């Protein structure tokens, strides 16, 4: 059914969803007030630390 997706370390029904902001930043949610702006480095996979 294509309803099972690999998360970072768990199985979730949804694929990883990413949003691209107007200012070029990347965040998980539409509102920039939340989101904990996504980061990357030294391991790939765009982990949020």
């Amino acid at each position: 059914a294509d309803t099972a997706y690999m998360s970072n370390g768990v199985l979730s029904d949804t694929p990883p969803t990413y949003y691209a902001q107007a200012d070029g930043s990347i965040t998980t949610t539409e509102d920039a007030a939340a989101g904990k702006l996504v980061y990357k480095g030294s391991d790939g996979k765009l982990t949020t630390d």
Partner: protein
């Protein structure tokens, strides 16, 4: 509804059968419904074993 944001998705993360089995075995107390099992259930007379 904010057009100033654009959604990107990372596909090709399709779950494999081994990954699903590992996930269901990871938690304790889950439910698995399968038919046409080796040994028991080989004739597949019944489907709902759980």
């Amino acid at each position: 509804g904010t057009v100033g944001v654009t959604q990107y998705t990372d596909k090709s993360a399709v779950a494999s059968s081994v990954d699903i089995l590992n996930a269901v075995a990871g938690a304790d107390g889950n439910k698995v419904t399968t038919s046409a099992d080796v040994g028991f259930g080989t004739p597949a007379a019944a489907v709902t074993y759980t």
